[PDB]
């Protein structure tokens, strides 16, 4: 799978002859191949079917979810715990099982997180499998001179293949004979209108010539013949799909943030361990013990529950997305939208609707606009003049297409219509604000029609007049406005008729250039009342000689048409630009249309100008103007092929409104890479196969759901099942909101760290009875704490999030030193002091004053000293003093909960005050209530001092942590005040997360 | 007091546990009330 | 990277900040932590003002007293060879440490010691738990009372020829009055003979029914010759109100001990305000694993 030969732009053998072609692959132009020869080739190289994707077994991704970066840290933690247990078992008799419990618990945490994360990605895969609807397809091949329809998988290189309007081009064909055949090259090349396939050659680029039919394309109207040049995966879209599969994946921004987070957590963990290791060796302890101390401090500095909390955090924002029809396949792709700063979009199928629609109309010397939006939510065009009625009769009659049988259910715009795209657009507009065309058509019987001619350049027909008072004959004709203008002499103004003086002839010329400059295609409609005296009701006007007056007709008005954009396209583009997101158009369509759609959706703000526009406004050559005075630029693909790396960098560095036109899929990929080389996150929004290599390499791909291709849908990371583009705005909003909350929750789960390690540190340095046990630290990190941390996600915005500029990746991180200074430095310190306060209180009330506790651990622990004197002279047995130590662990844990109250409240908001935002978050309130109920339950239920070793508390102790909590609240409140009044000051660059 | 000062070494942990559970229960209920109040 | 984030010379930065920054941050942390320390200290002083110097507010974690002994056994086992002297040194050293506090030289004068009944007697109340009267007075407890285990005659105390001693002791509790079982028809078998109301009985036996036979004659030594603690040595007024206070002691000689075999001996005190625990094996009773291997 050579990628460089797949990265290259397509080459071909188009510029040849029919003899050279038949001489290279071997084939009868009039008899085709022989069946024996056909099978000899079928077996020689492989069926004409793309390779299936590389199947992913479910145990592989389950093992994937069991690993990663965070789960790996918890894995090494479990490993360390079991190592310390082994050492204690082989070195000492009666080894405590604290470490073995902590290790099996960490392993269970990793396994449970893996099960949940895996279950979600499978849910998305099932709803994803319900979209591949693959109905077998059979082609028409000519062998031995006979026509046969065989499965698409049996076509080979060389046989003759015939196509018919409505069928799909099987393989890559070389047209040999056509009959007004048109094909839809929208998915592969990106051409909105049907390009006619002619046996003659026209352009050096194979995608532009008409003598080649392509894979996955469809023949709209006409029939054609051709020799199969390319077959199977070796086809154009085959090389594109194989390239898409052979591209790497990447590493999202949220993952890099989690990685640098673990980097800091381990920095401070191994620092505290190697240091308290040298310190313990300096105080006399033996090596065997110091090793256990090192492992204990490092393992203690690992967040066991932050994994489940972060996973649930990410999972919550994804359901909100699935409620508005925005589905993500992975789980972290939910944050990438908010961090995006440059959106590369596609035109055909993404920025537009890929359906021709009647846009503007000319009548009564006045331009009228029609609604060109999917759900028909706009402005009507004043259907009260007679002129409009006559126009409806012209277009509704002089038109041969009709809705496909059985569409009585779909809406007027989404139904199937058999015919050209122009007659279809006209039929839909008339059927839209003029009611049923089928009765409008049977109300006036068509007598004789002369089909569109290459010389006449017009389509005309005569029908009877339904006026029950006028039995005359009606004649209607449509065609190019220039040709029809040369055939009129009257004008239907507001109903009456008038001459064609040059005043209205010039008004017709300016109208023609107005609709033309709009990137639209205009047509002219005229009609005339045939005198029943010179052509009675019995006379038959056979289509042979001049039976109808070509000139002296009555022109009624022009009718333009173009593919309109989706409803929320302009508003969404404006919203993205408001958020500081650079919108760059990248499409393989004609630049004259790309520039118009760009200006219509907001990519090229009205007023900005290109170098050619300046040369045209001044009437000077283009080589004279300076390119710095042009904000927006239209880069052609042909020119893009010849450009250096620095040139592309400068194109993106100096032009704010860029539009890449006529760019191949490979060039699309080159453009995405050119955006990444600098340092910005990229999101590519597309629909066809040409977008597959662009959606894959982009930081985040957005594929359309209804109008998208299966390849680009399988290679994308986010799917828009409703084809609504406003979902992108919703996504960029949610991506930010869920970010500021992760910061708050992380500071919360990190603040408790300190009051959990300090007891042990003072235990080794000061030799006091152990303050915080192991089953209590576990009841804090994995119990009470979980609900509050999960609730911190439901926090609403503080300021407008859709207003600030995108976060800088190289400077504004997720976990900086400003957070560590708060959690580990200021709040956690106060919480630790409160815990030690409740501790000393419990031991002072039972008889052990603070002066006699320093220096006791050797006898306080000894299991054979049944006479330990306290500050008053009483003798305490071993089990009696241990019961008090355990009751001190219970109250220490309760003190933690008490200080966590004020920590969850000061963590709710990062800048704003509590009296401003408000306690409207019901989940946080529930977290506080439950957090308290669990602590009371663990202490007061019978049999806990047996099972978990937590004894009941005497009601006066529960109040030893209250002052510390109020102080935490007042300190953080004054903190969040100087930041507001003093922007950019010390408190901000020192304490603002 | 004097010789029969047995009360000086007794504590009614039973009554304390009963009350502490009543209270935990109440706080738990209140919590649920707040949580579901609005979805009805 | 490596070098710059350490010291750049254009912005004159060290590790990241300038000179005035490291100072602003260090000064802030010093003031902050100083306030934190002062607050914690104030909240601990009010705690010292909430407690009394003559009595522990809560005395429920020490209601049923323990029963400890003189030798320091690692796993409640006494194992030593009658030939090798460097085998029972750890025992004699401790035993000695305990009896070294009942020396007569220590107990002398009228202050703060007082001569009490040579025969078990009743309680003695030296008033309340106050400082009104000065330092209360405690009864004298002589060494010699313990007859063959006193280290005054056979320093070793027994361990020299297969006849060890075990000095039992009742855990000191403030304001605790020991109360013995009354003479009514329900009383253990053992306790019936010699019912001096004034004596708290201590009686040792064998854990298993088999071992009875292999344990010979338990000879107890005490005040008055009884196997118990005289009620006159109570209550204890606490260190502050009674420094130089001696708790009674009871010696137990395990004469006629079978040689080369592990013996499980459980000693137990009997009384009203005395209750045992299946979890704490030192509450009221105690266990010893003697093995005089020679
Ligand atoms: C409480 O009483 C303890 C015993 O008191 C003795 O008996 C009472 C009834 C009175 O008569 C009293 O006056 C007696 O002293 C008392 O402990 C004793 O302290 C002395 C002084 O250090 C010790 O004497 C020294 O003995 C060693 C060898 O000891 C051997 O035996 C003991 C057991 O008894 C073992 O533990 C040892 O390892 C030995 O196996 C002598 O080598 C040492 O020599 C020193 O003195 C000589 C002159 O005699 C000098 O020439 C040397 O240079 C040395 O300076 C002493 O003779 C005595 O051993 C010790 N008894 C015990 C049983 O340990 C204790 O201090 C008192 N405590 C308080 C708080 O009042
Ligand atoms: C029994 C007793 C109990 C003991 C309990 C102890 C509890 C432990 C509590 C806290 C642990 C402290 C450990 C150090 C934490 C430092 C945080 C840290 O390393 O965070 C990482 C940051 C990175 O941040 P960023 O990503 O935003 O960078 C972006 C840079 N861009 C964008 C320019 C490229 O790196 C930086 O900050 C740069 C590194 C700065 C390192 C400073 C080291 C100071 C340590 C000790 C000083 C002691 C002196 C005492 C004497 C004072 C004089 C009187
Ligand atoms: C000595 C002991 C020390 C203890 C220290 C720890 C303390 C931590 C615990 C509690 C601290 C409570 C702080 C009180 C803050 C009140 C703030 C407040 O009231 O600000 C008013 C807000 C603002 O409104 P607005 O103008 O934006 O509205 C606009 C409406 N529009 C849009 C329609 C116009 O109004 C709102 O938020 C809406 C109404 C919300 C009402 C909330 C009431 C619940 C408050 C606390 C729950 C109790 C927790 C107890 C935990 C213990 C468990 C055992
Ligand atoms: C929206 C959904 C709402 C759902 C809310 C659910 C809340 C559930 C509320 C209560 C159920 C809790 C479990 C009940 C346990 C009953 C235990 C019991 O009745 O024990 C009685 C006996 C004690 O007898 P004794 O006094 O003679 O013993 C003397 C022992 N001497 C003398 C040797 C010291 O027990 C013994 O003997 C042996 C003791 C056995 C230990 C069992 C304790 C289980 C340990 C940990 C599980 C707790 C996890 C926390 C889950 C939180 C969920 C929110
Ligand atoms: C959604 C909100 C959830 C809230 C729940 C709170 C989360 C709790 C988180 C961590 C706590 C789990 C730690 C497990 C501790 C096991 C301790 C253990 O095994 O100790 C072994 C002890 C032996 O002690 P010894 O040597 O002194 O015996 C001497 C006996 N002599 C002397 C008489 C012979 O044996 C005994 O106690 C025997 C009785 C066995 C008791 C097993 C109790 C298991 C408790 C919890 C496990 C299930 C929790 C799942 C919920 C997860 C929530 C996310
Ligand atoms: C905005 C957020 C609102 C949040 C509301 C949450 C609802 C709170 C729910 C319940 C709390 C009430 C608890 C009452 C329990 C009394 C039970 C009792 O009988 O307990 C007696 C103990 C004395 O025990 P002992 O050791 O002396 O005897 C032990 C004797 N043995 C052991 C021998 C038996 O006493 C005790 O537990 C004392 C109980 C604690 C006293 C409550 C203090 C209230 C603190 C601040 C609230 C102030 C509100 C001011 C109004 C402002 C309006 C604008
Ligand atoms: C032992 C002592 C006990 C004392 C108890 C005192 C209780 C006092 C009770 C209520 C306090 C008064 C209500 C405050 C209402 C203020 C309303 C308001 O308009 O506020 C606005 C200002 C912020 O203005 P800005 O210019 O920064 O906005 C900048 C906005 N931008 C950024 C968009 C430009 O807000 C602020 O200043 C808020 C700053 C307030 C900081 C004081 C905190 C007081 C401490 C505790 C309160 C008690 C609650 C807990 C109960 C415990 C029961 C045991
Ligand atoms: C049990 C637990 C108890 C805990 C109680 C804790 C109380 C201690 C609270 C605060 C003490 C710390 C004060 C430190 C003052 C020296 C700091 C200093 O040297 O600062 C210098 C700067 C002035 O330099 P610059 O910005 O002009 O230069 C620009 C330079 N460039 C560009 C780097 C920004 O100072 C500034 O900005 C002004 C900023 C001053 C910091 C205000 C922080 C106030 C926080 C809390 C006070 C509230 C206590 C409430 C307690 C109620 C108890 C019931
Ligand atoms: C949507 C609406 C939802 C509403 C739901 C409402 C749920 C119901 C709410 C409350 C129920 C209250 C039940 C009160 C039970 C009292 C039991 C009790 O007082 O037992 C105490 C005694 C043990 O005393 P001791 O002498 O061994 O003490 C030790 C003495 N030393 C150690 C010094 C020797 O019990 C014993 O002997 C026998 C104990 C037998 C086992 C009883 C099981 C109780 C365990 C859990 C039930 C509590 C759940 C409450 C809900 C909390 C939600 C988080
Ligand atoms: C000086 C030393 O002190 C005692 O041992 C000490 C080391 C070791 O034994 C343990 C049990 O393994 C340690 C363990 O290492 C680390 C912890 C699991 C740690 C963590 C909490 C957490 O969440 O993550 C890590 C905090 C303390 C801890 O909970 C226990 C506490 C009991 C202790 O026993 C204490 C013995 O008395 C020993 O004999 C004597 O030599
Ligand atoms: C101490 O135990 C010994 C047994 O070890 C007792 O003496 C034995 O008595 C039996 C008769 O009952 C004789 O057959 C043995 O020969 C004796 N052995 C020895 C070594 O004397 C002795 O009576 C016990 N003494 C006490 C006071 O209990
Ligand atoms: C919003 C803030 C101010 C509310 C603070 C509520 C505090 C004071 C409440 C919450 C839970 C309560 C405790 C819950 C349980 C018990 C056990 C019981 O046997 C005595 C009361 C006691 C000890 C309560 C005392 C008051 C208490 C700590
Ligand atoms: C708001 C903050 C900064 C106030 C902190 C006040 C500090 C400095 C005060 C509060 C309580 C004070 C202590 C209270 C009691 C004693 C005992 C006395 O025998 C010596 C002084 C000493 C040790 C005091 C030293 C100063 C102290 C700790
Ligand atoms: Mg497209
Ligand atoms: Mg991707
Ligand atoms: Mg932790």
Domain of residue C261: give its range.
1-294
The annotation status of A347 as a binding-site residue, yes or no, is yes
How far apart CA C233 and CA C136 sit, in angstroms, is 13
A584 contact partners, CB below 8 Å, separation of at least 6: A342, A343, A344, A345, A603, A652, A658, A659, A660, A671, A675
Bridge partners (DSSP) listed for residue A196: A182
Task: Quote the Cα angle for A73-A76-A78, to 5°.
Answer: 110
CA distance A587 to chain C (A): 41
Q: Give the span between the Cα atoms of A807 and A366, in whole angstroms.
A: 49
Interface of A with C (CB under 8 A): 825-826, 829-830, 833, 836-837, 840-841, 844-847, 849-850, 864, 866-867, 869-870, 872-880, 883-884, 954, 963, 967, 986, 990
Inform me whether the C-beta atom of residue B17 falls under 8 Å from chain A C-beta atoms. Answer: yes
Q: How far is CA A964 from CA A15, A893, A899, in A?
A: 85, 14, 7
Residue nearest to atom 36 of ligand 6 (CA): A955
Ligand 14 centroid – CA A688 distance (Å): 5
Listing DSSP states for A587-601 in one string gives ESS-HHHHHHHHHHH
A794/B contact by beta carbon, under 8 A: no
| Bridge-based pairing state of the strands A582-587 and A342-345 | parallel
Tell me whether strands A138-143 and A160-164 are parallel, antiparallel or unpaired: antiparallel
Report the distance separating Cα A500 and Cα A512, nearest Å.
16
Q: Is B25 in the pocket of ligand 9 (CB under 6 A)?
A: yes
Ligand 7 pocket test, candidate residues A913, A928, A975, A976, most atoms within 8 A of CB: A913
* Pair B1, A896: CB distance under 8 Å: no
- Name the nearest CA neighbour of A337 among A682, A596, A631, A774: A682
DSSP state of A348: I
* Both tokens assigned to A241: 């799909």
d(CA A138, CA A153): 8
For residue A290, give the DSSP letter. H
List the single residue in B23, B27, B35 with the smallest CB-CB distance to A922.
B35
Tokens of A773: 């046990």
Closest CA to A603 of A613, A611, A595, A612: A595
- DSSP E strands in C91-237: the ranges are 113-114, 138-139, 165-170, 199-206, 215-221, 228-230
Assigned CATH for A354-564: 3.40.1110.10
Distance separating alpha carbons of residues A814 and A263, to the nearest angstrom: 12
Q: How many residues does chain A have?
A: 993
CB A276, CB A269: distance < 8 Å: no
Backbone dihedral region of A26: left (phi > 0), alpha (psi from -120 to 50 degrees) or beta?
Answer: left
* Nearest alpha-carbon partner for A303 in A85, A106, A83, A104: A106
Q: Which of A75, A169, A86, A81 is nearest to A114 (CA)?
A: A75
CA distances from A938 to A943, A960, B11, B21 (A): 10, 19, 20, 10
Residues of chain B in contact with residue A938, where contact means CB-CB under 8 angstroms, are none
Q: Is A587 annotated as a binding residue?
A: yes
Taking the Cβ of residue B38 and every Cβ of chain A, the question of whether any pair is shorter than 8 Å is answered with yes
Strand boundaries in C30-189, DSSP class E: 67-69, 77-80, 113-114, 138-139, 165-170
- Alpha-helix runs per DSSP H in A449-584: 481-485, 502-517, 569-578
The C-alpha atoms of residue C115 and residue C102 are separated, in whole angstroms, by: 14
Q: Are strands A218-219 and A182-184 parallel, antiparallel or unpaired?
A: antiparallel
Report the Cα A381 to chain-centroid distance in Å: 36
Task: Assign 3-class secondary structure to A713-780.
Answer: HHHCCEEECCCCCCHHHHHHHHHHHHHHHHHHHHHHHHHCCHHHHHHHHHHHHHCCCCCCCHHHHHHH
Q: Is A452 annotated as a binding residue?
A: yes
Handedness of CA A848, A850, A855, A860 (dihedral sign): positive
The first and second tokens of residue A481, run together, are: 């406005």
Helix axes A922-940, B13-36, angle to 10 degrees: 160
Name the CATH superfamily, with its identifier, for domain A341-353+565-725. Answer: HAD superfamily/HAD-like (3.40.50.1000)
Maximum C-alpha span of chain B: 64
Alpha helices per DSSP H over A301-385 = 306-323, 336-339
Answer yes or no: A346 catalytic. Answer: yes
Burial class (CB in 10 A: 0-12, 13-18, 19+), A139: buried
As given in the structure block, the two tokens for residue A653 are 């560095």
Resolution in A: 3.0
DSSP H or E segment with residue A238:
helix A236-245
Contact yes or no for A794/A737 (Cβ under 8 A): no
- Report CB contact under 8 Å: C174, A872: yes
**Alpha carbons A211 and A183: distance in angstroms, whole number:** 11
B38/C contact by beta carbon, under 8 A: no
Closest residue in chain A to residue C53, using alpha carbons only: A872
Q: Give chain C's domain count.
A: 1
User: Which atom of ligand 2 lies nearest, measured to the CA of C16?
Assistant: 38
Distance A298 CA to ligand 10 centre (A): 13
Question: Residue A147: which residues within 8 A CB-CB, separation 6 or more?
Answer: A140, A141, A162
Catalytic residue of the set A346, A563, A589, A972: A346
What is the rounded end-to-end Cα distance, in angstroms, of chain C?
A: 75
Counting beta carbons within 10 angstroms of the beta carbon of residue A400, is it exposed (0 to 12), middle (13 to 18) or buried (19 or more)?
middle
For residues C138 and C220, give the distance between their C-alpha atoms in angstroms, rounded to a whole number: 24
B25: which residues sit within 8 A by CB, 6+ positions away?
Answer: A933
CA angle C241, C246, C247 (to 5 degrees): 105
Bridge partners, residue A168, by sequence: A218
Which of A154, A239, A222, A240 is CA-nearest to residue A184? A222
- Give me A488's structure tokens: 């009129």
A636-640: which pairs have CB atoms within 8 A and are 24 or more residues apart? A636/A591, A636/A661, A636/A662, A637/A588, A637/A661, A637/A662, A637/A663, A637/A664, A637/A667, A638/A662, A640/A667, A640/A670
3-state SS class at A927: helix
**Beta-ladder partners of A165:** A167
Q: Is A348 annotated as a binding-site member?
A: yes
Beta strands in C171-225 (DSSP E): 199-206, 215-221
Give dist(CA C222, CA C207) in Å, integer: 24
* Surface-to-core class of residue A803, CB atoms within 10 Å of its CB (0-12 exposed, 13-18 middle, 19+ buried): exposed
Which residue is closest in CA terms to ligand 2's atom 37? A817
Phi, psi (degrees; rounded to nearest 5) at A183? -130, 155
Cα of C221 from ligand 11 centre, angstroms: 23
Of A834, B10, B6, A841, which is closest to residue C51 (Cα–Cα)? A841
Which of B16, B27, B38 has its CB closest to that of A933? B27
The two three-digit tokens of residue A686, written as one number? 């597309």
Q: How far apart are CA A212 and CA C229, in angstroms?
A: 116
Show the ligand 1 pocket: residues with CB < 6 angstroms: C 100, 103, 105-106, 151-152, 155
Contact A142, A353 (CB under 8 A): no
- Alpha-carbon distances, residue A421 vs A195, A594, A635, A748 (angstroms): 12, 19, 29, 61
Residue numbers of B between 8 and 27 with CB closer than 8 Å to C: 8-11
CB of A918 shorter than 6 A to ligand 3: yes
A232: which 2 tokens?
A: 């199977």
Q: Positive or negative CA dihedral for A709, A710, A716, A720?
A: positive
- Cα three-residue angle A370-A374-A375, rounded to 5 degrees: 95
| Beta strand ranges found along A247-318 (DSSP E) | none
* CB-based contact A787:A309 (threshold 8 Å): no
Ligand 4 pocket, A943 CB below 6 A? yes
- How far, in Å, CA of C166 to CA of C156, rounded? 12
- Strand ranges inside A238-394, DSSP E: 326-328, 342-345, 360-362, 367-369
CA-to-CA distance for A214 and A191, rounded, in angstroms? Answer: 13
Decide whether any atom of ligand 4 lies within 6 Å of the A942 Cβ.
yes
A877 in a known ligand binding site: no
Question: Considering CB atoms only, which of B2, B3, B9 is closest to C59?
Answer: B9
Q: Residue A473 burial by CB count (10 A; 0-12/13-18/19+): exposed, middle or buried?
A: buried
Residue C25 structure tokens:
């941050």
Indicate the helix (H) or strand (E) that contains A391.
helix A386-397
Give the pairing type, strands A700-704 and A718-720: parallel
Question: Do A875 and C47 make contact, defined as CB atoms within 8 angstroms?
Answer: no
Q: How far apart are the first and last CA of chain A?
A: 47
CA angle A926, A930, A936 (to 5 degrees): 155
What residues does each domain of chain A span? 2-47+127-246, 64-117+247-340+726-993, 341-353+565-725, 354-564
Reported as half-sphere exposure (CB side, CA atoms, 13 A), residue A498 has a value of 16
Cis-peptide into C235, omega within 30 deg? yes
User: How many Å is the Cα radius of gyration of chain C?
Assistant: 28
Rounded Cα–Cα distance for residues A313 and A793 (Å) = 6
Question: How much distance in Å is there from the Cα of A309 to the middle of ligand 16?
Answer: 13
C-alpha R_g of chain B: 20
Rounded Cα distance, A474 and A525, in Å: 14
Who contacts A500 (Cβ-Cβ below 8 Å, separation ≥6)?
A488, A489, A490, A491, A555
Which tokens in the block code for residue A839?
A: 């501790």
CB contact under 8 A, C60 and B11: yes
A215-235 burial: b if 16+ Cβ within 10 Å, else e: bbbbbbbbbbbbbbbbbbebb
Locate the chain B residue with the closest alpha carbon to C57.
B8
Q: Which of B3, B5, B9 sits opposite C60 (nearest CB)?
A: B9
Do residues C61 and A883 touch, judged by C-beta distance below 8 A? yes
Check the CA dihedral A704-A706-A708-A710 and report its sign.
positive
Cis peptide before C112 (omega within 30 of 0): yes
**CATH class of the A2-47+127-246 domain in this structure:** mainly beta
Q: Select from 2.60.40.10, 2.40.50.140, 1.20.1110.10, 1.10.645.10 the CATH code of A64-117+247-340+726-993.
A: 1.20.1110.10
- Give the three-class secondary structure for A19: helix
Helices (H) then strands (E): counts for chain A: 38, 30
Q: How far apart are the first and last CA of chain B?
A: 61
Residue A628: how many other CB atoms lie within 10 Å: 8
Three-class secondary structure of residue A268 per DSSP:
helix
Q: Which two tokens stand for residue A228?
A: 């199969």
Dihedral angle sign, alpha carbons of residues A310, A312, A316, A322:
positive
Q: How far is CA B12 from CA A797, B8, B17, B20, C75, in A?
A: 51, 12, 9, 13, 35
Between β-strands A367-369 and A402-403, what pairing exists: parallel, antiparallel or unpaired?
Answer: unpaired
- The gap from C-alpha A97 to its chain's centroid, in whole angstroms, comes to 49
Contact C32, C42 (CB under 8 A): no
Pick the residue from chain A with its C-alpha nearest to B11: A954
**Is C56 in the A-facing interface, judged by CB distances under 8 Å?**
yes
Strand partners, A177: A225
Q: Which among C86, C103, C144 is the best mutation to test ligand 1's pocket, defined by most ligand atoms within 8 Å of the CB?
A: C103
**DSSP 8-state class, residue A608:** B
Instruction: Return the partners of chain C (3 or more C-beta pairs < 8 Å).
Output: A, B
Residue boundaries of the structural domains of chain B: 10-36
Give me the phi and psi of A335, to 5 degrees please. -90, -30
Half-sphere exposure of C144 (CA within 13 A, CB side): 3
d(CA A713, CA A705): 7
**Counts of helices then strands in chain B (DSSP H, E):** 1, 0
Tell the residue number behind the tokens 């989706």, with chain if given: A566
Which residue of B25, B35, B39 is the best one to mutate when testing the A interface, meaning the one whose CB has the most A CBs within 10 A?
A: B35
Distance from CA of B1 to the nearest CA of A (A): 21
- By C-alpha distance, the chain B residue nearest A920 is B34
| Both structure tokens of A301 | 């500095």
Closest CA to A156 of A238, A7, A43, A2: A43
Burial of A70 (0-12, 13-18, 19+ CB in 10 A): buried
Which of C59, C123, C179 lies closest to B8 in CB terms?
A: C59
Which DSSP letter does residue A349 get? I
Radius of gyration of chain A (CA): 38
Q: How far is the CA of A487 from the centre of ligand 2 (A)?
A: 87
């708050």: which residue's tokens? A744
| C84: its two tokens | 């090798």
C175 and B8 within 8 Å at the Cβ level: the answer is: yes
- Chain center to CA of A672: 15
Q: Print the SS3 string covering A562-579.
A: ECCECCCHHHHHHHHHHC
Q: How far, in Å, CA of A789 to CA of A741, rounded?
A: 10
Closest CA to A331 of A322, A341, A343, A340: A322
Q: Which two tokens stand for residue C120?
A: 């078990």
């Amino acid at each position: 799978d050579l990628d460089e030969l797949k990265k290259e732009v397509s080459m071909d053998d188009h510029k040849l002859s029919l003899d050279e072609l038949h001489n290279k692959y071997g084939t009868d132009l009039t008899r085709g191949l022989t069946n024996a020869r056909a099978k000899e080739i079928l077996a020689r190289d492989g069926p004409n079917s793309l390779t299936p994707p590389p199947t992913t077994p479910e145990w592989i991704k389950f093992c994937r979810q069991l690993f990663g970066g965070f789960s790996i840290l918890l894995w090494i933690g479990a490993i360390l715990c079991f190592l310390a247990y082994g050492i204690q078992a082989a070195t000492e008799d009666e080894p405590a099982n604290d470490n073995l419990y902590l290790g099996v618990v960490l392993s269970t945490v990793v396994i449970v997180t893996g099960c949940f994360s895996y279950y979600q990605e499978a849910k998305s895969s099932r709803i994803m499998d319900s979209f591949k609807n693959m109905v077998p397809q059979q082609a028409l091949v000519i062998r031995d001179g006979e026509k046969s329809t065989i499965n698409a998988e049996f076509v080979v290189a060389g046989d003759l293949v015939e196509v018919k309007g409505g069928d799909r081009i099987p393989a890559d064909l070389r047209i040999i004979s056509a009959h007004g055949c048109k094909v839809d090259n929208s998915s592969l090349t990106g051409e909105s209108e049907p390009q006619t396939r002619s046996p003659e050659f026209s352009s050096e680029n194979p995608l532009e010539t008409r003598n080649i039919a392509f894979f996955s394309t469809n023949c709209v109207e006409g029939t054609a013949r051709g020799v199969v040049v390319y077959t199977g995966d070796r086809t154009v879209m085959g090389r594109i799909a194989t390239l898409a599969s052979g591209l790497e994946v990447g590493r999202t921004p949220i993952a890099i943030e989690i990685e640098h987070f673990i980097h800091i957590i381990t920095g401070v963990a191994v620092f505290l361990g190697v240091s308290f290791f040298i310190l313990s060796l300096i105080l006399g302890y033996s090596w065997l013990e110091a090793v256990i101390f090192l492992i204990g401090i490092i393992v203690a500095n690992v967040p066991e529950g932050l994994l489940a909390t972060v996973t649930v955090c990410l999972t919550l924002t994804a359901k909100r997305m699935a409620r508005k029809n925005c589905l993500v396949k992975n789980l972290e792709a939910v944050e990438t939208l908010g961090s995006t700063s440059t959106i590369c979009s596609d035109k055909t199928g993404t920025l537009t609707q890929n359906r021709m629609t009647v846009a503007h109309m000319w009548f009564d010397n006045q331009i009228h606009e029609a609604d060109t939006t999917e759900n028909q939510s706009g402005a009507a065009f004043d259907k009260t003049s007679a002129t409009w009625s006559a126009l409806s009769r012209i277009a509704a009659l002089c038109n041969r297409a009709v809705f496909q049988a059985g569409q009585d259910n779909v809406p007027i715009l989404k139904r199937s219509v058999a015919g050209d795209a122009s007659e279809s657009a006209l039929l839909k507009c008339i059927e839209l604000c003029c009611g049923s065309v089928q009765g409008m058509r049977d109300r006036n019987p068509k007598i004789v029609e002369i089909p569109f001619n290459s010389t006449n350049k017009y389509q005309l027909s005569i029908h009877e007049n339904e006026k029950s008072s006028e039995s005359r004959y009606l004649l209607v004709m449509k065609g190019a406005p220039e040709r029809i203008l040369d055939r009129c002499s009257t004008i239907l103004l507001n109903g009456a008729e008038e001459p064609l003086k040059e005043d209205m002839k010039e008004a017709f010329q300016n109208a023609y250039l107005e609709l033309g400059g709009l990137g639209e295609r205009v047509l002219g409609f005229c009609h005339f009342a045939l005198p029943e005296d010179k052509y009675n009701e019995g006379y038959p006007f056979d289509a042979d000689e001049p039976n109808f007056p070509t000139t002296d007709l009555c022109f009624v008005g022009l009718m333009a048409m173009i593919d309109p954009p989706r409803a929320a396209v302009p508003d969404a583009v404006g919203k993205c630009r408001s958020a500081g997101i650079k919108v760059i158009m990248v499409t393989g369509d004609h630049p004259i249309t790309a520039k118009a759609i760009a200006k219509g959706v907001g990519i090229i703000s009205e007023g900005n100008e290109t170098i050619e526009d300046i040369a045209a406004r001044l009437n000077i050559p283009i080589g004279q103007v300076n390119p710095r005075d042009a904000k927006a630029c239209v880069v052609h693909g042909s020119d893009l092929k010849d450009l250096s790396t620095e040139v592309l960098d400068d194109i993106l560095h100096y032009h704010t409104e860029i539009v890449f036109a006529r760019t191949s899929p490979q060039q699309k990929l080159i453009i995405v890479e050119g955006c990444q080389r600098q340092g910005a996150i990229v999101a590519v929004t597309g629909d066809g196969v040409n977008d597959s290599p662009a959606l894959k390499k982009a930081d985040i791909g957005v594929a359309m759901g209804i109008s998208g291709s299966d390849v680009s849908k399988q290679a994308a990371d986010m799917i828009l099942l409703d084809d609504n583009f406003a979902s992108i705005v919703t996504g960029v909003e949610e991506g930010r909101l869920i970010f500021d909350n992760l910061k708050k929750s992380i500071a919360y789960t990190l603040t408790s760290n300190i009051p959990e390690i300090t007891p042990f540190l003072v235990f080794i340095i000061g030799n006091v009875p152990l303050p915080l046990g192991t089953v209590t630290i576990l009841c804090i990190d994995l119990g009470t704490d979980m609900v509050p941390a999960i609730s911190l996600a439901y926090e609403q915005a503080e300021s407008d999030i859709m207003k600030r500029q995108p976060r800088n990746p190289k400077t504004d991180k997720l976990v900086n030193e400003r957070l560590i200074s708060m959690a580990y430095g200021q709040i956690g310190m106060i919480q630790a002091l409160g815990g030690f306060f409740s501790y000393f209180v419990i031991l002072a009330e039972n008889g052990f004053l603070p002066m006699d506790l320093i220096g006791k651990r050797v006898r306080w622990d000894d299991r054979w000293i049944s006479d330990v004197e306290d500050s008053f002279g009483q003798q305490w047995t071993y089990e009696q003093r241990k019961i008090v130590e355990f009751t001190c662990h219970t109250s220490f844990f309760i003190s933690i909960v008490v200080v966590q109250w004020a920590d969850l409240i000061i963590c709710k908001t990062r800048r704003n005050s509590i009296f401003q935002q408000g306690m409207k978050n019901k989940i946080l309130i529930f977290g506080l209530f439950e957090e308290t109920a669990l602590a009371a339950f663990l202490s007061y239920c019978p049999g806990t001092d047996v099972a978990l070793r937590m004894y009941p508390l005497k009601p006066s102790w529960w109040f030893c942590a209250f002052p510390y909590s109020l102080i935490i609240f007042l300190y953080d409140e004054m903190r969040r005040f100087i930041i507001r009044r003093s922007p950019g000051g010390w408190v901000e660059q020192e304490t603002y997360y | 007091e004097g010789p029969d000062n047995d009360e000086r070494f007794t504590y009614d942990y039973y009554r304390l546990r009963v009350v502490g559970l009543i209270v935990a229960a109440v706080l738990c209920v209140i919590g649920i009330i707040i949580l579901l109040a609005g979805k009805c | 990277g490596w070098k710059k984030f350490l010291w750049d010379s254009e912005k004159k930065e060290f590790l990241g900040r300038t000179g005035s920054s490291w100072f602003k941050i260090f000064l802030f942390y010093l003031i902050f932590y100083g306030c934190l320390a002062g607050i914690f200290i104030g909240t601990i002083q009010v705690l010292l003002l909430t407690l009394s110097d003559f009595e522990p507010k809560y005395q429920d974690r020490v209601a049923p007293p323990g029963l400890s002994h003189a030798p320091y056994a690692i796993k409640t086992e006494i194992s030593f060879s009658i030939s090798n002297p460097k085998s029972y040194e750890s025992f004699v050293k401790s035993m000695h440490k305990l009896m070294d506090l009942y020396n007569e030289s220590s107990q002398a004068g009228n202050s703060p010691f007082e001569d009490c009944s040579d025969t078990p007697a009743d309680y003695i109340k030296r008033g309340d738990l106050d400082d009104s009267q000065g330092q209360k007075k405690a009864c004298r407890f002589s060494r010699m009372w313990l007859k063959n285990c006193s280290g005054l005659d056979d320093t070793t105390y027994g361990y020299a020829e297969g006849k060890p001693c075990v000095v039992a002791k009742l855990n000191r509790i403030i304001g605790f009055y020991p109360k013995p079982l009354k003479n009514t028809t329900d009383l253990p078998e053992e306790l019936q003979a010699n019912y001096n109301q004034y004596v708290l009985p201590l009686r040792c036996a064998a854990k298993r029914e088999e071992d009875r036979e292999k344990i010979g004659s338990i000879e107890y030594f005490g005040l008055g010759g009884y196997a118990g603690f005289p009620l006159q040595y109570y209550p204890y007024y606490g260190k502050r109100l009674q420094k130089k206070y001696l708790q009674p002691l009871l010696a137990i000689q395990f004469t006629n001990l079978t040689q080369n075999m592990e013996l499980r001996i459980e000693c137990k005190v009997y009384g009203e305000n005395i209750d045992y625990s299946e979890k704490d094996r030192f509450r009221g009773r105690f266990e010893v694993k003697i093995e005089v291997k020679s």
